[PDB]
Design a protein around this ligand. Sequence first.
Ligand SMILES: CC[C@@H](C(=O)NCc1ccc(C(=N)N)cc1)N(C)C(=O)[C@@H](Cc1ccccc1)NS(=O)(=O)Cc1ccccc1
Ligand SMILES: *[C@@H]1O[C@H](CO)[C@@H](O)[C@H](O)[C@H]1NC(C)=O
Ligand code: NA
Ligand code: NA
Lengths: 251, 11, 28
Amino acid sequence: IVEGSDAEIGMSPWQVMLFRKSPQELLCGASLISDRWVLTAAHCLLYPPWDKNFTENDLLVRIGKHSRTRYERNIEKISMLEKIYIHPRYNWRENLDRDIALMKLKKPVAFSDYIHPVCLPDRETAASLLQAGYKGRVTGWGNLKETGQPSVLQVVNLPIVERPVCKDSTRIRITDNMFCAGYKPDEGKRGDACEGDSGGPFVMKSPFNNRWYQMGIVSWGEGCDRDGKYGFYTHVFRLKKWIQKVIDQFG
Amino acid sequence: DFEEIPEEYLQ
Amino acid sequence: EADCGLRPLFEKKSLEDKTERELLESYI
Ligand SMILES: CC[C@@H](C(=O)NCc1ccc(C(=N)N)cc1)N(C)C(=O)[C@@H](Cc1ccccc1)NS(=O)(=O)Cc1ccccc1
Ligand SMILES: *[C@@H]1O[C@H](CO)[C@@H](O)[C@H](O)[C@H]1NC(C)=O
Ligand code: NA
Ligand code: NA
């Protein structure tokens, strides 16, 4: 996260760290959506241009974390993966269309002060909140600058951007399964996700029922926090039918 | 750069 | 889950975090 700040304790109890077993390193962010299901970006698991194709046994999920590198004894919980599910129409060849994947845990994780699932949006909440100017929140342990690394989880609030502005900011083909967020050059304020934040959640707090909903997944961006560029996020509601299909079939 | 995690999670 | 999106250390004890008001103010 670039130009964000340290998270408060328990601020984002759905935040998950995707952790590579060997070598031990941060792979991606992710989010807890039930006691056995974790949501992330497909490109965290599968991205052939970078020779990335992880299997279940390659990875661990670390939940309840604050510190990036510490083993947070008596606080974090570490889960093994039973199965990865990548969207069948995930487009890694072109523009990361449908950049979404689910991971089923081998055992349920116990909820605590530090570990708690985020809601997924239904149609009405999505329609109400996914509006240009409305701000969401992005969290992660990714890089602090495009070109070091944070001691603890970082947070930044960013406004959703009008779709024509998103489109005009890039040569990449944008789809309805994406939205973009961030400040404009004229707006002064800054901030963006970056490398290592991928798969993490873009959340919004509904003013109707005061619950946090995950509207987006950190997906892609040209550099990090560049003037005139924006962060792009997987549109979670647009892909919720796939999410529900997988959980209904395999959960 | 990361603290070692308990062996039980690597088995 | 029925309890989703309510944080133990914030919503559950009616405490706000330091910047959630920024979000609310944007929801016009
Ligand atoms: C998975 C590939 C992806 C990527 O690196 N995504 C991670 C990412 C997430 C968020 C942000 C951001 N919000 N600024 C940037 C990158 N990627 C190549 C990019 O984003 C590409 C554009 C692209 C999009 C879709 C298909 C192909 C190319 N831009 S890029 O500038 O190459 C990504 C990057 C950023 C900083 C440092 C190193 C690399
Ligand atoms: C990724 O890995 C699996 C098995 O290791 C393989 O079958 C598949 O063809 C690879 N490439 C993909 C899904 O693009
Ligand atoms: Na364009
Ligand atoms: Na920018």
